Design a protein around this ligand. Structure first.
Ligand code: 0OV
Ligand code: NMN
Length: 313
């Protein structure tokens, strides 16, 4: 028989060890231990939580299966607005963007280039390391509060290793394989299929029963912060590294490009790498790397002047 005193301590040990394995597997996409190692520890933890339910915590990995059912979503304000992107569709559009940027800044400028993840924009707020809100972008200043759903998204950390208070933003999406699998399941049960993974991700995040969401195999790539503060990055490329460092999943395919020509080369590179990716992209996002230069260019009503989305036709 395990006592409550012994259980309380052991559960924390298990949470920590299981969450680390989960970080490796779900965020770094590189598990260190064999699944049975994880499964055996996880069952030990379930046994403890079953026997002493009071030991269940929000950062325990058993909570990933969800359980909550909402009546609706609360409004989720974004005091720091979530903008959208200006678009370009031609080589010319991208070079014109660069020409306008140089005209404004007065010198050559480096670009951080990222794949444009075809999904939904999300915002994740942490207080003292604890996940406390997840939100859709919505209309840019108000989205929906989908905190409970995002708890089931395995790459989203429930507790960061460092008790940092930050709100990070990125994309939540459904991998191609999961998209295919989910549509087959819908065909089998007489449901209408989703037209594409973007729509499947959106419908999934709109579900009110978290237990169903937990089954939809959603994933994330984080690419910015709303409010910096403790963050030390001074360039986007630094921001991507820092996001990884503090425990978020980031897309590995980014490159710091020192000329607009390098940018065009990146676009052509991944335009042909496109189909080999396990996820859908609808283009490339080109960002002015230096945050100080981003500030200098500012924002239109709709979008930053320091970035542009090259859309695949
Ligand atoms: C520059 C813009 C606007 C200001 C906030 C930051 C944002 O950058 C960015 N980066 C990405 N990698 C992606 C992406 O993959 C998929 C969709 N969007 C649109 C959104 N939200 C991305 N936006
Ligand atoms: N470190 C690992 O090898 C590792 C970590 C998390 C999940 N998994 C696997 O993922 C599947 C589902 O696990 P969870 O529902 O606990 O996230 C299981 O088959 C489990 O073995 C493996």
């Amino acid at each position: 028989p395990l006592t409550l005193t012994a259980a309380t301590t052991r559960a924390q040990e298990l949470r920590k060890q299981l969450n680390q394995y989960s970080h490796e597997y779900y965020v770094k996409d590189q598990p260190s231990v064999e699944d049975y190692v994880y499964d055996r520890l996880y069952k030990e933890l379930v046994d403890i939580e079953t026997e002493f339910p009071d030991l269940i915590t929000p950062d325990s990995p058993t909570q990933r299966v969800g359980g909550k059912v909402l009546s609706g979503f609360e409004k989720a304000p974004h005091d720091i607005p979530m903008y959208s992107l200006n678009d370009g569709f031609s080589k010319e559009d991208i070079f014109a963007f660069d020409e306008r940027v140089r005209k404004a800044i007065g010198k050559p400028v480096a670009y951080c280039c990222e794949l444009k993840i075809d999904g939904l924009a999300i915002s994740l707020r942490y207080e003292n390391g604890v996940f406390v809100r997840g939100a859709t972008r919505g209309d840019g200043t108000v989205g929906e509060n989908i905190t409970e759903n995002l708890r089931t998204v395995r790459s989203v950390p429930m507790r960061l290793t460092e008790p940092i208070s930050v709100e990070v933003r990125g994309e939540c999406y459904m991998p191609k394989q999961s998209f295919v699998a989910l549509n087959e399941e819908r065909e089998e049960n007489g449901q209408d299929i989703f037209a594409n993974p973007r729509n499947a991700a959106a419908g999934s995040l709109r579900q009110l029963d978290t237990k169903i969401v937990a089954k939809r195999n959603l994933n994330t790539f984080l690419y910015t912060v709303a409010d910096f503060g403790p963050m030390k990055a001074k360039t986007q490329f630094e921001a991507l590294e820092e996001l990884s460092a503090i425990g978020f999943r980031t897309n590995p395919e980014r490159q710091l490009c020192q000329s607009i020509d390098e940018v065009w080369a990146y676009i052509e590179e991944y335009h042909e790498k496109r189909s080999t990716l396990p996820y859908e992209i609808d283009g490339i996002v080109i960002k002015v790397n230096e945050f100080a230069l981003q500030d200098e260019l500012g924002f239109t009503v709709k979008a930053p002047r320091w970035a542009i989305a090259y859309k695949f036709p």
